[PDB]
Design a protein around this ligand. Structure first.
Ligand SMILES: Nc1ncnc2c1ncn2[C@@H]1O[C@H](COP(=O)(O)OP(=O)(O)OP(=O)(O)O)[C@@H](O)[C@H]1O
Ligand SMILES: [Mg+2]
Lengths: 51, 238, 385, 241, 99
């Protein structure tokens, strides 16, 4: 809120892509979306119990 | 690969448990051996963990097994501790049998022997300790230097280094050393040891420890002051 | 300041005058040819109507017809005829029909996929060649297999034979490998594809090898081209799923590589770089020569080398106030060039607590201790002591 | 992966099982020895407590192994129990054979082998016990050591094991004095134990104490375990209560 | 109070764009005659932990799920009771439908 960034939470999900439909080639896509809505904070939660 | 167990061989023919045993040796303090002609000097890094560590009662990295054979180690400190005691019961026992003190050539076999035995078996892990055994014979006055390794293979070297960045000291040694003329004065040979040990401590003159074996059951541990003078000679010339 | 300005002087004037030129010139281009060009525009316009129904070309039969399958769904038996050729039409291309009678009125389109974005990079590195400084004996090796046979083909016909295909950069982490792929490709100005080998595993089963077909289908059209497969070490024990990526796929993706890089296809004129931190992880047949030729081994930079690497990082910095810079290098032995970039990172972090804007010499000594402590664990000297 | 039995190494020359055994230790309470030339204090903290746990009738984290060497325990108390019996039996074996109360070094070295032995041989579990050995022998005077579960030893001027090892060590070395007093050594142990331990008030009942001294009457060696009330009074003096 | 009602195979897409229209129907209706309760009888088809979306048949369901989330967030601070719903397994649920 202070920096004024969109806190975009990522998690590997299959729900954040309606097109490729997986989080493996949505790493590339993440950068381009976050680039439109910059500055941004990418919160990739490595939960390592999600799946 | 075939590290799931010790007894199973390996397509590659290398028992993995031995190879990893070597890797463990690099954990522990550097030790270097250099033979003269009238001396062997056996020095070791004595790495200080904290300033609360005693020098009153805390073990030295160098242990005399008998009264004219000297031993340093590099490796798992826990493991070394029983290896040194086992070495010693036999060593003394050598006199029980023969009424002769311990010969350095019989001793390297024995230390390699306890180790070989542990590897051969399956219900024990090998020792993660390579040792340098320095000494002279009782009968004779030619300097003798031996090594044991985890594997249960033993060698003789003119000068040899093990533990903590061993490679870098090994190369250093080659360049300095001469096999045509090994140093025939105890002092100059000591000095070669100090120069080696300097490198791995980076800075210390209170963390370099030097021990010397000389013939006829002379073993001495050098004063911390005495080592600093040698460091003084080495810093000035450089 | 006055040195900066000399550079700034040329840059402003020359391009901004060209901008002002191009703006006026949009009009001006039409004026010398307006009766070949508008004549051609007229005849183009007359046959094709409006709209231009885009279909996707399945295939042509070479006799002046083709079978197209539109997205709007109907298939049509078209004619290749007028402002279009048989060489301009190749499967998977998107062709322009005239709506009222499907006659192929041209092709102006080949790519529009989201897929090809992935492979290409819109790159701008902050370190270019000659910030790879030191290890120069072995940068000379990557040159010979990537840069220099592109730059002069002369030398590789003067010696005869083929120019060596590809390379593997491999060794300890921190040894500057990444910066090599990005910087030799700066020199050449060849098309830098980049894909990671943690992105060569897929969360769908048997799509993994389809992706690996895409990398050198892309490479081959945009060639001469430098394909970076970064971290192909992640092929041996790093995989997204097991019942929808599985064991089959991991092996298949490597089989796929073989056919791309020295199979019939052959795919000559793609320089391949593979960075891998362990070459004993890699597949025996992908470290077969004659698809990646010679291997370059890197090691934790040596004592004189780390001078070079310290000067690259502290050129940015405001320098040491008392100077102990030459002794920093000495204390380090058997250490990475990434330790050097984490040390000037760590010096200016201690400085960042104060939120002072200068940096002094003393921060260096502190910062080296701080970051050496982080490296060494409490169970290393637990296990040992 | 390599988190199995003891014969097997990790390809990094780590036996995971010694590494985990270390980590066992910081799931039982803080235990501190501070050496002084006037005596050694051993001080310990209870792992947990309740309001009807009886802990004023007995000790169970301070055991005498003999009449001049005593140990504080941190770690699994089950693993501890067998090793304390083996230590104590040996302590009297030495007594029988030589007519001297066992040297501190011989006793630590024995137990270092034994811990090592359960890792090295067979299928038996390693031990996950840290004992602070505090002794007297007429060779080296006053002596402090501690032994790892790994099966090796180092001599100290101060050491902390048990929970909160890093912090408890830091506060100790910060205010340590080389000659010290026995009285100050007791005070520095409460000062540290307060900040490391997450109990709100530091109560006499969360403390065990023993002191080994030759300066409480010379000619003789006196082992003085503090009773609850002595512990209770010394908190007052230092003004925590 | 008013009681409403669907099942996720009453959100059946057997014509294109059928299925998202159902989501908008039930929720708008609930708000209007509030207090109200929406029951979605089983959601094991909408609540699928993973998705493909590499074919048309997924994407209609995926759009239903996403729209479902959006209207429950709007739904808050109204005198309606928020959606009653039931599931079979415990790992039908997305970390998105449980948040
Ligand atoms: N010889 C050198 N000259 C200049 N900078 C160097 C040099 N070597 C290393 N570096 C610096 O260290 C940084 C970190 O290394 P880099 O990211 O290139 O990794 P790497 O060795 O390929 O590791 P991995 O590929 O296993 O992740 C470089 O980006 C660069 O700044
Ligand atoms: Mg890299």
């Amino acid at each position: 809120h202070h920096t004024d960034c969109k806190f975009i939470r990522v998690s590997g999900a299959e729900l954040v892509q309606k097109y490729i439909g997986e989080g493996s080639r949505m790493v590339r896509e993440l950068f381009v979306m976050a680039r439109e809505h910059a500055p941004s904070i990418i919160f990739m939660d490595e939960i390592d119990s999600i799946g | 690969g075939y590290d799931r167990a010790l007894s199973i061989f390996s397509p590659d023919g290398h028992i993995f448990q031995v190879e990893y045993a070597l890797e463990a040796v690099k954990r522990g303090t550097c030790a270097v051996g250099v033979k003269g002609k009238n001396c062997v000097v056996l020095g070791c890094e004595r790495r200080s963990t904290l300033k609360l560590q005693d020098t009153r009662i805390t073990p030295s990295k160098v242990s005399k097994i008998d009264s004219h054979v000297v031993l340093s180690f590099s490796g798992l400190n826990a493991d070394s501790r029983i290896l040194i005691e086992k070495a010693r019961v036999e060593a003394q026992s050598h006199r029980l049998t023969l009424e002769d003190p311990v010969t350095v050539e019989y001793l390297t076999r024995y230390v390699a022997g306890v180790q070989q035995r542990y590897t051969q078996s399956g219900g024990v892990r090998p020792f993660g300790v390579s040792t340098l055994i320095a000494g002279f014979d009782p009968r004779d006055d030619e300097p003798k230097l031996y090594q044991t390794e985890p594997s249960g293979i033993y060698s003789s070297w003119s000068a040899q280094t093990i533990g903590r960045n061993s490679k870098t000291v090994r190369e250093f040694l080659e360049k300095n050393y001469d096999r045509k003329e090994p140093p025939a004065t105890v002092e100059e040979c000591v000095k070669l040891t100090v120069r080696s040990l300097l490198e791995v401590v980076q800075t210390g003159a209170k963390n370099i420890e030097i021990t010397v074996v000389k013939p006829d059951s002379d073993i001495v541990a050098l004063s911390s002051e005495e080592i600093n003078q040698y460091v003084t000679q080495i810093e000035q010339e450089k | 300041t006055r040195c900066k300005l000399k550079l700034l002087r040329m840059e402003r004037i020359k391009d901004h005058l060209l901008l002002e030129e191009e703006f006026v010139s949009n009009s001006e281009i039409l004026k010398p040819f307006e009766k070949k060009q508008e004549e051609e525009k007229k005849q183009l316009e007359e046959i094709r109507g409006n709209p231009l129904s885009i279909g996707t070309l399945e295939e042509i039969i070479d006799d002046d017809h083709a079978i197209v399958t539109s997205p709007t769904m109907p298939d049509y038996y078209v004619s290749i005829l007028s402002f279009v050729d048989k060489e301009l039409l190749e499967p998977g291309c998107s062709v322009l029909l005239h709506h009222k009678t499907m006659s192929i009125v041209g092709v102006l389109q080949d790519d529009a996929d989201p897929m090809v974005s992935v492979m290409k990079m819109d790159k701008s590195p902050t370190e270019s060649y000659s910030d790879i400084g030191g290890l120069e004996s072995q940068i000379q090796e990557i040159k010979e297999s990537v840069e220099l046979p592109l730059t002069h083909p002369e030398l590789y016909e003067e010696m005869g034979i083929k120019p060596p295909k590809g390379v593997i950069l491999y060794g300890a982490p921190g040894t500057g490998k990444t910066l090599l792929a990005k910087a030799v490709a700066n020199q050449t100005s060849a098309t830098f594809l980049r894909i990671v080998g943690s992105e060569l595993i897929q969360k769908y089963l048997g799509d993994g090898p389809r992706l690996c077909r895409q990398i050198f289908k892309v490479a081959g059209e945009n060639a001469p081209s430098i394909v970076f497969i970064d971290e192909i070490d992640a092929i041996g024990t790093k995989r997204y799923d097991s019942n929808s990526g599985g064991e089959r796929e991991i092996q298949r993706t490597m089989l796929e590589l073989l056919n791309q890089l020295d199979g019939f296809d052959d795919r000559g004129d793609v320089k391949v770089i593979m960075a891998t931190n362990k070459i004993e992880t890699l597949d025996p047949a992908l470290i077969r020569p004659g698809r990646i030729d010679r291997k370059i081994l890197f090691e934790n930079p040596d004592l004189s080398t780390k001078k070079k690497i310290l000067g690259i990082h502290t050129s940015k910095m405001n320098l040491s106030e008392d100077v102990n810079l030459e002794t920093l290098v000495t204390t380090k032995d058997d250490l990475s060039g990434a330790d050097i970039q984490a040390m000037c990172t760590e010096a200016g972090l201690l400085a960042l607590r104060e939120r002072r804007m200068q940096v002094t010499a003393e921060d260096f000594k502190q910062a080296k201790e701080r970051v050496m402590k982080n490296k060494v664990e409490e169970n290393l000297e637990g296990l040992y002591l | 992966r390599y988190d199995s039995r003891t014969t097997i190494f990790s390809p990094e020359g780590r036996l995971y099982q010694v590494e985990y055994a270390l980590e066992s230790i910081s799931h039982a309470g803080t235990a501190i020895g501070i050496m002084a030339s006037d005596g050694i204090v051993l001080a310990a903290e209870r792992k947990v407590t309740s309001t009807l746990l009886e802990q004023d009738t007995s000790t169970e984290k301070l055991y005498k192994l003999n009449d001049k060497i005593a140990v504080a325990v941190a770690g699994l108390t089950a693993d501890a129990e067998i090793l304390i019996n083996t230590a104590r039996i040996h302590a009297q074996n030495y007594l029988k054979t030589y007519n001297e109360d066992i040297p501190v070094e011989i006793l630590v070295r024995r137990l270092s082998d034994i811990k090592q032995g359960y890792t090295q041989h067979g299928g038996l579990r390693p031990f996950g016990v840290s004992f602070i050995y505090a002794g007297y022998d007429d060779r080296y005077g006053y002596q402090l050591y501690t032994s790892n579960p790994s099966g090796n030893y180092t001599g100290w001027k101060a050491i902390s094991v048990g929970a909160n090892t890093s912090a408890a060590q830091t506060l100790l070395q910060m205010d340590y004095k080389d000659d010290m007093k026995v009285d100050d050594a007791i005070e520095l142990a409460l000062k540290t134990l307060s900040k490391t331990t997450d109990s709100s008030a530091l109560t006499y009942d969360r403390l065990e104490f023993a002191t080994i001294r030759k300066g409480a009457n010379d000619g003789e060696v006196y082992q003085k375990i503090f009773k609850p009330q002595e512990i209770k009074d010394i908190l007052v003096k230092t003004g925590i209560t | 109070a008013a009681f409403i009602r669907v099942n996720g195979s009453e959100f059946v897409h057997k014509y294109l764009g059928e299925g998202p229209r159902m989501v908008r129907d039930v929720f708008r209706l609930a708000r209007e005659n509030a207090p109200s309760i929406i029951f979605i009888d089983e959601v094991d088809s909408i609540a699928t932990k993973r998705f493909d979306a590499q074919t048309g048949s997924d994407r209609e369901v995926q759009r239903i799920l996403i729209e479902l989330l959006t209207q429950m967030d709007g739904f808050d601070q109204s005198t309606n009771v928020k959606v009653i719903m039931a599931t079979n397994r415990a790992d039908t649920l997305d970390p998105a439908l449980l948040r």
